[PDB]
Amino acid sequence: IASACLYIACRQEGVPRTFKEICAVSRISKKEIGRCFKLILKALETSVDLITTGDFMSRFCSNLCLPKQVQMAATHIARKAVELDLVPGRSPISVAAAAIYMASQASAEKRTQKEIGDIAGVADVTIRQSYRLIYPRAPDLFPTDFKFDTPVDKLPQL
Amino acid sequence: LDLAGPLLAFLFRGMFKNLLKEVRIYAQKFIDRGKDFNLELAIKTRIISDGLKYSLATGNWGDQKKAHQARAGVSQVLNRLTFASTLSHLRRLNSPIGRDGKLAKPRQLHNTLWGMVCPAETPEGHAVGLVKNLALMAYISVGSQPS
Amino acid sequence: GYKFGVLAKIVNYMKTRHQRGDTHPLTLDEILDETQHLDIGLKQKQWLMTEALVNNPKIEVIDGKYAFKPKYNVR
Amino acid sequence: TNYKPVANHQYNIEYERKKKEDGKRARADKQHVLDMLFSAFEKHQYYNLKDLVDITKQPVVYLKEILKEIGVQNVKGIHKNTWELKPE
Amino acid sequence: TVPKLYRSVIEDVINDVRDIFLDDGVDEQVLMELKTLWENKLMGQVEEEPLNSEDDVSDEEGQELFDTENVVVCQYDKIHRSKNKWKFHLKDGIMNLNGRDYIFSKAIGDAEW
Amino acid sequence: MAYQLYRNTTLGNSLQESLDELIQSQQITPQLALQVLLQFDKAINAALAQRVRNRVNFRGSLNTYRFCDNVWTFVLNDVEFREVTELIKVDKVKIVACD
Amino acid sequence: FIQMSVQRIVEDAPPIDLQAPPRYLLKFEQIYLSKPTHWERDGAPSPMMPNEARLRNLTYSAPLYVDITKTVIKEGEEQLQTQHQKTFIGKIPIMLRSTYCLLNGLTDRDLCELNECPLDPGGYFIINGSEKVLIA
Amino acid sequence: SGIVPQLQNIVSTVNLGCKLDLKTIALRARNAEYNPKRFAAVIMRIREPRTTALIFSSGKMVCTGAKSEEQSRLAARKYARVVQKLGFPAKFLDFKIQNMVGSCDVKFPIRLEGLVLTHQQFSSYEPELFPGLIYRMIKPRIVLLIFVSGKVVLTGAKVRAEIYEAFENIYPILKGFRK
């Protein structure tokens, strides 16, 4: 109950933490935390705003030690991908991880799929799927005034 | 003279003893249940964090539960009325009050204070001779191994 | 241990007989055959007969053959 | 790298796997449970319910019912009131 | 191969029963005679209570009664089923197919229901 | 008082028949025969566990299955026992498993 | 204190022995201390300047990490040794202008750019934005 | 609307009115399995209805997997007849359909974000836990799993009328969030 309440408090304060992030600090499993979260929402008769990719960008990029420009590029890429509906049904965390990978590979500070998955709580395979979904339109997703250390055409294909 | 280092070392030793105590308790519960334990979950960071912060903030030097026997006045708000006041506060010394002080009065300018403690600087009132200031070139040994 | 749970099993068998309803008393050797007590030593059986069967209040002795007392329990 | 997000803790999944593989203790027949109880009493005169449950490998409620049928709880001045496997 | 394994099993069995033959006080010639004979032998229904409204809703039960067909006896480590198929991690065991015997350590099986 | 799996096979049947012959001849007591069967079960279990180091595969269809007291009683049809060295075809098979 | 005493205290702390059968041994090996850092509500770490701490009523503290080796003896004749690198155990308030403060080795121009008086001697702690000095 | 949900699974409970021996049923039945360590009931399967039934020692049985109400009732009767053929006095008492599951497709992608924003009182969308949005209809007590692909799964219905009514209610709402 306490872990689910902590997750709900983060969501309500507007700095949501992933269920995996909460589980990492709580002895309770992610499944139990989610079940208690649903029950708490029903009991309180309240609601929490849907999470967006931009919610986790600051924390993920800071933990990856990426530049502010790379963080902005990743946030823009994720938001534009959601707007264009290139990742339907995909989890916001997965979309954010894929966008961060794209930005990191396009910038000097390059981070591996394993690294991004470790910080974001998302499997490298899921990151691969989301990145493959957003890769075809990478030039469209990237911000206009972005300094590509690696040209968008030569971004990793996978 | 117990400077910031040794005092913080005493506090940190106490808090680390505590930290290992809760680590033992948490791990023991899981071991008794037969399931392995997560080391990261076993650690309470607030022990060290809040202990150091509370000691330095309140000035009661010791565990917040043992404030009765915890030394007081060790930590004070830096005096910023003047630069000279700030320097004096940073070079201040505090004499003890207890059996030693009762048996021998430290409210006096002992000959040994030459070159070590300022002979003129001392508060007026109940603190005369108990609060002292280092001489300009006085240095306090930081300690090293005798090996 | 040895030679205690077997006695407990015999006494439980007597309760099972009484849930059956066979008022007629039965021979101890036949009870042993039914309960697979042949393996047990004979001397323990003799000690049971001499001491424990009489001590047990539920058990009764009629015409040299041991069985519960139909008078003790309410009918 | 500390507190990296994780769906479930390794110790928790290992313990859950052990529990699932072991499975809940089954309610065996009264005759077999009684025989096992009588065998245990032969080894030891006095048994605590917690260890007797481990020996019998039966549900606590079912074992308590069968043990209430025959054995009796004796209050002790040394440790605590415990079961007595002797029917009398 | 299988006969050689059988001979090794014979050796193990006789060695394992020697101690019992000493415990029971029986003479050792019994084991020799046993081995000799063993080798020789080897080589709108509103009122729904009545269920009779349906008939022939079963199959022939004589297969298990017969058991004459080929039979496999082994131990199972894992057996999983997903809505159509049965999967088999059967470990070391024995098989009796067409009289001839087969020996195995790991057996993997997939079947449909 | 053991696993008692291989008794209903060719080997166990031959052993049981031999014990029956000796019992008819009064050479061995039935308790001795039962002890021999128990020792045979132990030895055969150990022998199959240790001296067998070959893997087998098989496929087919299942017609019936049963489970009780940790005893599976599968009944398959048109089974193909495939091995790297040889392949065997069988119209029907009954797989009895225990653990 | 920071360089010698913390590490020596951790080393001198007896290894944790647990058993209740498998037995676990926990040993604390090495101390790591990062620069004073502040975490925003979103969870993004960022270096905490002393002026920022003073203005925002923060505590000028540095994260503290220990290397912890856990060895489990299962009684099965194999022992599993796993090392957790830089496990966070708390934060230590940092004396300003010390070797572990952000204003260490900075030129007067850098201090001015950071809005810190070059004449400020440091030697104190910022706890909840209050400059605390430890009296000898 | 032109679309009708099709049932994927029906759960029905029926009391046989007599105590049973699970071990005997496991030993004598054809497709039955009994693992008291795992579960306290006996799980049996019949292919021709293509359904699975759990039988308890209390005499109550649960039948699942039936795609139709008639199939569920017939399968329950068949299981009861099998138990009866095993010699028990099994009967068919208080047969009831406890829950029905239906599935369908709206044939267009859906914006679950807009749907949850509009119907937060009934909607629950947590991609972390489950990609499908859970909608709790009140007038029918039906839970709908709506997916971005357009697939909709309704559950909690006691009768097919509830499934159809719930889909009729939800379809106009979904049409307003067509992607």
Side-chain angles (χ1 to χ4, degrees):
Chain A
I1 299 166
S3 305
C5 285
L6 184 64
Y7 172 86
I8 290 163
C10 290
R11 258 176 168 262
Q12 292 182 344
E13 287 277 332
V15 288
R17 305 300 198 281
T18 71
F19 280 107
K20 285 186 172 53
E21 273 173 319
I22 302 299
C23 167
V25 292
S26 169
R27 70 157 187 89
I28 306 300
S29 74
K30 188 220 184 185
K31 170 174 58 57
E32 185 60 29
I33 288 166
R35 289 179 180 175
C36 288
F37 155 78
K38 297 266 184 63
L39 296 172
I40 289 161
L41 284 189
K42 287 187 178 73
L44 269 287
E45 293 182 351
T46 186
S47 292
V48 292
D49 296 294
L50 183 65
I51 52 157
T52 65
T53 51
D55 281 336
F56 316 98
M57 288 297 178
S58 179
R59 182 165 58 264
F60 292 178
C61 298
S62 303
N63 289 356
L64 287 154
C65 202
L66 300 179
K68 183 79 167 183
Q69 49 261 20
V70 177
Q71 172 176 335
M72 280 286 173
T75 309
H76 185 266
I77 288 159
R79 198 201 70 250
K80 182 62 65 68
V82 169
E83 287 171 347
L84 298 176
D85 204 78
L86 310 174
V87 298
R90 245 69 187 177
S91 170
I93 306 100
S94 308
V95 177
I100 292 162
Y101 181 61
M102 189 180 272
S104 178
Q105 294 302 300
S107 87
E109 291 289 270
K110 294 176 175 67
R111 301 290 185 274
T112 56
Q113 278 177 349
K114 190 206 193 172
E115 274 174 355
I116 295 162
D118 286 340
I119 296 89
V122 175
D124 59 358
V125 63
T126 299
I127 292 169
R128 187 151 46 255
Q129 292 198 5
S130 288
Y131 175 71
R132 191 172 292 122
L133 281 164
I134 55 162
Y135 177 83
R137 292 187 67 154
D140 291 330
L141 298 170
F142 266 93
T144 50
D145 60 343
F146 184 68
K147 306 296 181 182
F148 296 75
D149 187 356
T150 298
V152 62
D153 286 8
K154 296 283 174 296
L155 269 165
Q157 196 274 339
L158 172 66
Chain B
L1 301 167
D2 289 338
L3 290 156
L7 285 163
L8 291 169
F10 164 79
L11 286 185
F12 187 81
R13 200 187 306 270
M15 287 170 294
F16 201 67
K17 279 186 197 293
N18 289 355
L19 181 67
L20 303 200
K21 190 172 79 70
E22 292 83 4
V23 165
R24 274 169 33 69
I25 289 158
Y26 176 96
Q28 193 64 268
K29 288 179 183 176
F30 285 57
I31 293 167
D32 299 327
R33 287 208 287 159
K35 50 175 81 185
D36 191 8
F37 71 107
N38 196 234
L39 185 64
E40 269 175 347
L41 307 187
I43 280 152
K44 282 196 194 162
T45 71
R46 288 187 75 72
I47 286 163
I48 282 162
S49 303
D50 285 6
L52 287 168
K53 194 207 283 204
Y54 162 85
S55 292
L56 277 152
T58 65
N60 299 329
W61 206 251
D63 193 305
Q64 56 204 274
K65 292 135 161 184
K66 294 290 187 185
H68 60 82
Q69 64 93 34
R71 207 147 59 261
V74 177
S75 186
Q76 313 183 341
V77 185
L78 186 63
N79 194 241
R80 289 271 196 191
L81 188 153
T82 314
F83 194 65
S85 78
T86 305
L87 284 171
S88 81
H89 207 192
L90 296 157
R91 310 182 97 241
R92 205 146 285 163
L93 320 175
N94 191 18
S95 308
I97 285 282
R99 183 172 180 181
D100 287 325
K102 289 169 186 72
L103 265 55
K105 62 191 171 296
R107 290 200 171 88
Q108 266 196 357
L109 198 71
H110 197 257
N111 300 88
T112 50
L113 292 189
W114 174 277
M116 311 296 175
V117 168
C118 182
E121 196 162 357
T122 189
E124 297 77 0
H126 69 104
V128 293
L130 304 188
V131 180
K132 296 148 200 167
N133 280 94
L134 292 175
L136 261 188
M137 289 210 304
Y139 177 63
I140 299 167
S141 75
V142 76
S144 70
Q145 292 301 333
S147 300
Chain C
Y2 164 54
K3 66 176 179 181
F4 278 104
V6 288
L7 156 62
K9 173 151 201 202
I10 299 295
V11 178
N12 281 134
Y13 190 61
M14 201 69 215
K15 269 85 69 181
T16 71
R17 298 296 299 164
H18 273 88
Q19 293 297 109
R20 297 281 71 73
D22 188 0
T23 307
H24 176 72
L26 310 163
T27 77
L28 189 151
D29 292 332
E30 171 265 353
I31 292 157
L32 299 172
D33 314 317
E34 286 177 348
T35 56
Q36 293 82 17
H37 282 89
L38 278 69
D39 54 348
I40 205 180
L42 278 291
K43 64 90 176 179
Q44 153 60 0
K45 320 177 195 179
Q46 275 76 65
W47 167 82
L48 288 174
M49 288 159 225
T50 196
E51 192 266 332
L53 273 168
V54 305
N55 291 140
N56 279 337
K58 294 161 77 68
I59 306 311
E60 179 181 41
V61 189
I62 296 169
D63 70 1
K65 182 174 73 175
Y66 299 75
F68 181 76
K69 187 176 287 184
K71 278 68 177 173
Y72 181 74
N73 299 17
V74 56
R75 267 76 195 179
Chain D
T1 65
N2 307 123
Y3 310 109
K4 59 173 279 184
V6 160
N8 200 351
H9 295 295
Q10 185 56 39
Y11 80 92
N12 217 350
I13 73 181
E14 282 161 16
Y15 172 80
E16 271 163 40
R17 182 184 300 118
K18 197 175 188 297
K19 288 284 284 296
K20 185 258 282 179
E21 174 265 328
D22 295 335
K24 297 182 288 185
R25 296 185 288 249
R27 169 175 292 175
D29 53 345
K30 308 177 80 196
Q31 299 300 114
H32 196 283
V33 170
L34 287 164
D35 309 332
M36 191 70 197
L37 181 69
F38 310 151
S39 304
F41 168 71
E42 291 163 338
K43 184 264 186 182
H44 210 269
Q45 184 73 31
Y46 305 133
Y47 275 108
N48 180 29
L49 182 61
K50 185 65 172 174
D51 309 301
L52 178 53
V53 165
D54 306 300
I55 294 161
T56 56
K57 293 196 162 292
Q58 294 293 303
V60 65
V61 173
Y62 175 69
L63 182 68
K64 185 187 174 191
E65 176 178 359
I66 303 302
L67 200 63
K68 189 191 297 204
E69 288 180 355
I70 47 175
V72 286
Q73 280 195 357
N74 65 338
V75 69
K76 287 190 178 181
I78 187 149
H79 199 255
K80 58 96 176 181
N81 190 329
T82 183
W83 281 97
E84 290 295 327
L85 283 59
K86 176 74 86 174
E88 50 264 16
Chain E
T1 300
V2 178
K4 288 151 72 200
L5 272 293
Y6 267 67
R7 277 86 168 95
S8 64
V9 167
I10 297 163
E11 290 153 36
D12 295 332
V13 164
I14 61 186
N15 279 254
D16 202 52
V17 299
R18 293 212 192 278
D19 67 279
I20 306 300
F21 300 169
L22 273 75
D23 198 328
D24 72 341
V26 168
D27 57 68
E28 181 50 36
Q29 187 268 332
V30 165
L31 189 39
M32 306 302 99
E33 210 283 336
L34 279 162
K35 195 201 310 204
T36 310
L37 287 177
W38 172 96
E39 292 184 357
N40 289 120
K41 298 288 277 274
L42 261 176
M43 295 292 115
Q45 178 181 20
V46 299
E47 190 276 331
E48 69 275 15
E49 301 278 34
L51 301 195
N52 198 6
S53 62
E54 61 175 0
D55 200 353
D56 209 346
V57 295
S58 170
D59 287 12
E60 190 60 52
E61 305 193 350
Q63 313 183 44
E64 170 60 19
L65 191 68
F66 265 93
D67 279 15
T68 302
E69 293 85 335
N70 291 318
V71 174
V72 177
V73 180
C74 55
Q75 301 269 101
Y76 66 97
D77 292 333
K78 291 187 182 184
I79 285 157
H80 196 285
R81 177 268 311 159
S82 302
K83 185 185 171 195
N84 194 5
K85 299 281 222 203
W86 280 82
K87 183 250 285 177
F88 302 101
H89 298 267
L90 306 171
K91 72 168 183 173
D92 306 77
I94 199 166
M95 321 197 283
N96 194 4
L97 315 184
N98 201 342
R100 176 138 170 73
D101 195 74
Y102 290 102
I103 201 74
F104 65 96
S105 162
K106 270 183 220 156
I108 302 303
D110 212 342
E112 178 271 357
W113 197 68
Chain F
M1 44 170 288
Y3 274 133
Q4 312 296 115
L5 277 78
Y6 313 95
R7 284 197 58 184
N8 192 267
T9 68
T10 49
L11 175 48
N13 198 354
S14 56
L15 179 54
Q16 202 274 333
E17 294 166 352
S18 303
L19 299 162
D20 269 304
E21 303 199 330
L22 282 72
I23 289 156
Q24 287 294 103
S25 75
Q26 194 48 42
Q27 173 172 17
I28 70 183
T29 191
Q31 182 174 1
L32 182 54
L34 267 69
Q35 288 285 288
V36 167
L37 288 163
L38 173 58
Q39 300 296 298
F40 152 75
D41 281 313
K42 304 179 141 71
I44 187 165
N45 271 280
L48 282 72
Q50 301 167 2
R51 275 88 71 81
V52 185
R53 309 289 286 169
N54 70 306
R55 179 171 82 75
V56 64
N57 188 358
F58 67 109
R59 304 280 193 149
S61 171
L62 193 143
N63 183 32
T64 301
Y65 74 105
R66 280 164 54 203
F67 180 82
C68 193
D69 296 333
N70 297 314
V71 181
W72 295 99
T73 304
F74 309 114
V75 181
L76 303 169
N77 286 321
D78 315 310
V79 180
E80 179 192 54
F81 285 83
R82 184 262 197 288
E83 189 172 11
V84 298
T85 189
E86 187 167 28
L87 292 92
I88 307 96
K89 307 271 171 56
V90 57
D91 186 290
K92 180 172 74 71
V93 165
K94 187 183 285 286
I95 297 171
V96 176
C98 295
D99 199 76
Chain G
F1 159 73
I2 289 283
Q3 286 155 359
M4 310 296 302
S5 307
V6 165
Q7 182 55 87
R8 190 190 60 246
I9 284 157
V10 163
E11 275 172 338
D12 291 6
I16 292 168
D17 279 24
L18 303 163
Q19 186 172 5
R23 62 192 287 276
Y24 309 81
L25 299 171
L26 304 164
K27 179 79 196 105
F28 300 73
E29 297 278 28
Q30 175 65 59
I31 284 286
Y32 299 100
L33 199 81
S34 47
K35 309 300 292 184
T37 309
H38 174 60
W39 279 267
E40 302 148 37
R41 55 182 295 155
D42 59 76
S46 197
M48 172 165 45
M49 312 320 301
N51 192 234
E52 299 169 11
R54 269 183 226 106
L55 285 175
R56 305 186 48 187
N57 276 23
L58 317 170
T59 305
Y60 200 61
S61 291
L64 179 72
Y65 311 98
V66 285
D67 273 357
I68 308 172
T69 72
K70 165 162 90 149
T71 67
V72 57
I73 298 89
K74 296 287 288 185
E75 203 170 1
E77 308 302 326
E78 53 270 3
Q79 76 181 2
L80 183 66
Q81 169 157 308
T82 57
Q83 57 185 39
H84 307 70
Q85 309 294 88
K86 300 160 206 280
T87 308
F88 174 61
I89 49 156
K91 306 180 187 176
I92 290 166
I94 294 298
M95 181 176 289
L96 279 73
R97 298 287 215 292
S98 59
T99 56
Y100 293 82
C101 175
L102 282 158
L103 317 181
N104 184 64
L106 292 190
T107 186
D108 297 344
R109 167 155 297 125
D110 278 8
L111 296 169
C112 288
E113 294 300 332
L114 294 174
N115 291 328
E116 290 282 338
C117 181
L119 311 182
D120 192 40
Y124 54 89
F125 308 82
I126 289 163
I127 312 303
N128 302 321
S130 181
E131 297 171 331
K132 310 291 281 186
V133 60
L134 284 177
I135 307 307
Chain H
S1 76
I3 295 160
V4 296
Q6 65 182 357
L7 305 188
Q8 307 298 278
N9 166 55
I10 295 162
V11 177
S12 56
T13 306
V14 69
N15 195 318
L16 305 182
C18 65
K19 292 185 85 73
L20 302 171
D21 182 277
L22 305 185
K23 293 184 289 188
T24 293
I25 294 160
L27 298 166
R28 301 171 57 192
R30 192 179 303 99
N31 294 110
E33 59 184 0
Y34 178 38
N35 194 336
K37 292 203 164 148
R38 188 167 56 81
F39 201 51
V42 171
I43 305 107
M44 197 191 303
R45 301 174 220 280
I46 56 186
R47 54 167 59 82
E48 186 272 321
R50 184 50 175 74
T51 67
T52 291
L54 320 167
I55 298 142
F56 296 69
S57 67
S58 294
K60 285 161 150 183
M61 175 185 65
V62 184
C63 179
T64 74
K67 296 288 187 182
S68 170
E69 302 94 319
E70 202 70 11
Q71 286 198 341
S72 189
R73 204 171 75 258
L74 296 170
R77 290 185 68 76
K78 286 183 178 182
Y79 280 110
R81 189 157 184 75
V82 169
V83 168
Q84 181 175 85
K85 287 287 209 300
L86 271 74
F88 302 84
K91 300 168 273 287
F92 212 68
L93 308 174
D94 68 273
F95 171 88
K96 188 184 182 196
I97 279 168
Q98 299 291 347
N99 168 49
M100 309 175 106
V101 173
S103 167
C104 55
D105 188 345
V106 306
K107 283 88 173 164
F108 61 84
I110 315 183
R111 290 182 293 108
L112 308 182
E113 301 86 343
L115 177 59
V116 60
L117 272 163
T118 309
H119 303 260
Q120 186 61 268
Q121 54 267 6
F122 321 119
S123 308
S124 167
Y125 184 45
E126 304 303 334
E128 291 188 67
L129 308 177
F130 181 63
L133 185 148
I134 296 92
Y135 195 104
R136 304 205 163 266
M137 210 169 277
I138 285 175
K139 169 168 79 72
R141 227 191 65 200
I142 302 302
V143 190
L144 307 97
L145 312 176
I146 302 97
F147 300 79
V148 297
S149 57
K151 302 286 185 43
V152 184
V153 176
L154 308 94
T155 189
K158 295 269 184 167
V159 301
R160 192 192 296 269
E162 294 173 61
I163 294 292
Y164 293 176
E165 192 194 340
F167 180 71
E168 293 157 1
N169 306 353
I170 205 77
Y171 193 85
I173 294 154
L174 299 183
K175 198 81 169 159
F177 301 100
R178 176 159 42 166
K179 191 215 291 171

